[PDB]
From Swiss-Prot:
Upper taxonomic lineage: Bacteria, Pseudomonadati, Pseudomonadota, Gammaproteobacteria, Enterobacterales
Presence of keyword Membrane: yes
Record keywords: Antibiotic resistance, Cell inner membrane, Cell membrane, Membrane, Transmembrane, Transmembrane helix, Transport
Recorded GO CC terms: plasma membrane
Membership in a protein family: Belongs to the major facilitator superfamily. MdfA family.
PROSITE patterns in UniProt: MFS
Pfam families reported for this sequence: MFS_1
Localization: Cell inner membrane
Subunit structure, as described in the record: Monomer.
Membrane topology: Multi-pass membrane protein
Gene that encodes the chain: mdfA
SUPFAM superfamilies, alphabetized: MFS general substrate transporter (SSF103473)
GO BP annotation list: regulation of cellular pH; response to antibiotic; xenobiotic detoxification by transmembrane export across the plasma membrane
Name of this chain's protein: Multidrug transporter MdfA
Entry's Gene Ontology molecular function annotations: potassium:proton antiporter activity; sodium:proton antiporter activity
Length: 387
């Protein structure tokens, strides 16, 4: 009867992903209008990322302290505001600011949004909702840059920010009068000292952190592409929206196929084996990705095909290694997730920034090398993590 409330959060989830996945393809348009250089294309994703790891930590225990409903709304409100208030910044210097504060609307999906389902809805109810909100995080980056390439053709870029403010409203007016709250730390002290100290406790876990990083480093070459896949292909390789959008699928369609097997071979195998099981393609992906752009700098096909091996592997391994890294520290679920979020993004954010220059002053070579760099990193944190 009240399954309309999960779907509202499903939508808010949906919008925040495409609100980054439809934007990166159409960032070129925005750069060639605000004027700065194609080096600002990825730097969209970057500022969108670096916002999510601002109050990531503080929103969890915070949405506990003063209700889940008013803080959640303060986010859906915060989203739609800066979804239309960025249309009236018009300069690239401060497009960032409004892109960055659109990225803080990311802590709201997990530290309170996801937490509201873990508090109210029960186990088997939570399963099918999370099985859903995992496909949102898979389909909205898969098919987003595909609508984001069929949106800059029939309309301008501006049409997206209206469409998101409105879709976040289709959820918001469905959450205006249909959002019950279940925060139990109402009327509690402004205890700020306790967070840092307790996050430093999961920071002291050389098995957890080294495992939390390895999650970042591994999933980075995936996000480093997404942020740079336009200016790699559109301006870098000089290809159209149907051709560049064609190359998003063989990659993603391989990530989906690795999430197909994972959920099927979760049974006949141990979690421990799966990571090493999905590791070989990851090794071979980033292996051959860059082992392509060795002498041939512009065989993007084999790079995209290499990021299809690597992609298949992230579906299996990366996903498994999530849980073990939650349970690598026998501590709170809220503190570990926030700790591994704020770590993964720090890898993502600052990883891309390095990934960017990697592409400029090096071209495609350096870039893929500063990909396999991360496969090496992750693997190097596996010789630690298991054996
Ligand atoms: C922020 C990028 C999320 C979409 C990419 C899907 C691959 C799984 C990455 C795991 C971390 C994602 N998250 C938001 C649950 O922390
Ligand atoms: Pr505590």
């Amino acid at each position: 009867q009240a399954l309309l409330f999960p779907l509202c959060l499903v939508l808010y989830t949906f919008s925040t992903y495409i609100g980054n996945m439809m934007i990166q393809p159409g960032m070129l348009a925005v750069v060639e209008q605000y004027q700065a250089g194609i080096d600002w294309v990825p730097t969209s994703m970057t500022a969108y990322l670096a916002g999510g790891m601002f109050l990531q930590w503080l929103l969890g225990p915070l949405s506990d302290r003063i209700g889940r409903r008013p803080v959640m709304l303060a986010g859906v409100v915060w989203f739609i505001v800066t979804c239309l208030a960025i249309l009236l910044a018009q300069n690239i210097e401060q497009f960032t600011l409004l892109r960055f504060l659109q990225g803080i609307s990311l802590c709201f999906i997990g530290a309170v949004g996801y937490a509201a389902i873990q508090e109210s809805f029960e186990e088997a109810v939570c399963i099918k909702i999370t099985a859903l909100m995992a496909n949102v995080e898979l389909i909205a980056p898969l098919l987003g840059p595909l609508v984001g390439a069929a949106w800059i053709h029939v309309l301008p870029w501006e049409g997206m920010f209206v469409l998101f403010a409105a879709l976040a409203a289709i959820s918001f007016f469905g959450l205006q009068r249909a959002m019950p709250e279940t925060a139990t730390r109402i009327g509690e002290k402004l205890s700020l000292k306790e967070l840092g100290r307790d996050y430093k406790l999961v920071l002291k876990n050389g098995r957890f952190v080294a495992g939390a990083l390895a999650l970042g480093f591994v999933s980075l070459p995936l996000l480093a592409w997404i942020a740079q896949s336009p200016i790699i292909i559109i301006t870098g390789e000089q290809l159209s929206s149907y051709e560049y959008g064609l190359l998003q699928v063989p990659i993603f369609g391989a990530l989906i196929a690795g999430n197909l097997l994972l959920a099927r071979l979760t049974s006949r195998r141990t979690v421990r084996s799966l990571i090493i099981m999905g590791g070989w393609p990851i090794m071979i992906g980033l292996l051959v990705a860059a082992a392509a752009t060795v002498i041939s700098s512009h065989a993007y096909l084999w790079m995209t095909a290499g990021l299809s091996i690597y992609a298949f592997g992230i579906g299996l391994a990366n996903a498994g290694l999530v849980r073990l890294t939650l349970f690598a520290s026998d501590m709170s679920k809220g503190t570990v997730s926030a700790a591994m979020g704020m770590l993964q993004m720090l890898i993502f954010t600052v990883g891309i920034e390095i990934s960017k220059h990697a592409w400029l002053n090096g071209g495609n070579g350096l870039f893929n090398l500063f990909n396999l760099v991360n496969g090496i990193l992750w693997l190097s944190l596996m010789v630690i993590f298991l054996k």
